[PDB]
Design a protein around this nucleic acid. Structure first.
Lengths: 252, 49
RNA sequence: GGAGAGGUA
DNA sequence: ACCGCTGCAAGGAATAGGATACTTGCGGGCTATATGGCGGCGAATACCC
DNA sequence: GGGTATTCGCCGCGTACCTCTCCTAGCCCGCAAGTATCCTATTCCTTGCAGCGGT
């Protein structure tokens, strides 16, 4: 018994109706509705369609109606239901074959900011994935610089997501050597989660704590909370850079 | 918008600029007309004016 | 095509 | 045989993301109130006998 | 009545050529494009009262 079935998709209504029966018994399915004039037109259409089809095996005719009433969505993207002006199947198969053939002959410091290679930067996907692998697997700032020069050579200017990705790779490279396993940051501050055996000078750490108690608070064995009004992505990047630099200068 | 745009873009006083001289521009800008809205008509003026 | 403005003899 | 401490529960907010319907922003594509010119003339009133 | 005067409204005011700008307001209706509430995952912690060692 559906108390108010006007606001339910055809798929949902059919699924709910499919919960009754399942055995030799005769099963009913009441879809209670408000006064019909108060119902929206699409609710009337869906209710008349669902009540129009009451047969065993009708789940496929209903599916093929829900498709071509809502239409199939972007074949290559999201938005599964809807017109969406999707690309044709002939184009999709051609692009898939092209990517396949091209691929055959081939083969954390998160700061709540986009750090990626945008589509307008590198159109094709395989190059993007290859550069992701190259940046994430680069173990020296020199190789990060080489990747940066290669990017500039092959595509020109580096978008802000690309530069943020590269400097995040550099920061993670520094932190891997240092001992900070997870350096976090948001608009309001961040948390430093050190390793079991970090390389932070204890006396200098206590000096930082006692000079800025408001900006350095140990909450746990390895969790250090710092509170900073990090409104800007660039300012946060440089503040983290200098924090880690002053850390490594005192590393023991 | 209509009330002001219509006047500026299309009126009997907002006229093209003769520009084939510095002198042309100057003398044109200093012009003192007697026609237009609220003014007498070119083809019904006696000698006295 | 028609309006309006300016200009030459 | 009293007491500060630890630990086992209690108490829930904010998002992702697939739904469902509201709310509107818009653009193309429709319908629908004067006051600087005279001169001449013929016809239409006014009138005072 | 009528001869006269007075008013009122209509009709009329050069040729030829060159440059330029601009030719409805507003409504409606449908497209379509951008938003408040409902379930199953997630990261975010801050209290209340009984055990409980320990002396």
């Amino acid at each position: 018994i559906i108390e108010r079935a006007d606001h339910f998709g055809l798929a949902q209504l059919h699924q709910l109706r499919g919960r009754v029966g399942r055995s030799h018994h005769q099963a009913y399915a009441w879809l209670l509705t408000p006064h019909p004039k108060a119902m929206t037109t699409d609710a009337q259409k869906r209710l008349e369609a669902i009540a129009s089809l009451e047969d065993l095996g009708a789940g496929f005719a209903l599916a093929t109606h829900d498709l071509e009433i809502r239409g199939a969505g972007e074949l290559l993207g999201e938005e599964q239901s809807g017109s969406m002006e999707t690309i044709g199947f002939s184009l999709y198969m051609e692009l898939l074959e092209n990517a396949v053939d091209a691929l055959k002959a081939g083969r954390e410091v998160e700061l709540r900011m986009p750090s990626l290679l945008p589509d307008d930067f590198i159109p094709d996907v395989n190059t993007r994935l290859s550069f992701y692998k190259r940046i994430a697997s680069a173990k020296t700032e020199n190789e990060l610089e080489e990747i940066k020069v290669e990017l500039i050579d092959r595509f020109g200017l580096l978008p802000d997501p690309a530069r943020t990705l590269l400097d995040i790779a550099r920061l993670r490279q520094q932190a891997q050597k240092l001992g900070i396993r997870k350096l976090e940051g948001n608009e309001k501050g961040g948390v430093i989660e050190f390793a079991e055996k970090n390389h932070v000078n204890p006396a200098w750490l206590i000096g930082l704590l006692q000079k800025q108690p408001q900006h350095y608070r140990l909450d746990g064995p390895t969790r250090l909370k710092f509170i900073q009004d990090l409104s800007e992505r660039k300012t946060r990047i440089e503040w983290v850079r200098q924090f880690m630099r002053e850390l490594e200068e005192n590393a023991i | 918008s209509a009330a002001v745009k219509e006047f500026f873009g299309s009126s009997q006083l907002s006229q093209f600029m003769d520009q084939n001289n510095p002198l042309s521009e100057i003398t044109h800008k200093r012009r003192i007309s007697a026609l237009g809205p609220g003014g007498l008509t070119r083809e019904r003026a006696g000698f006295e004016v």
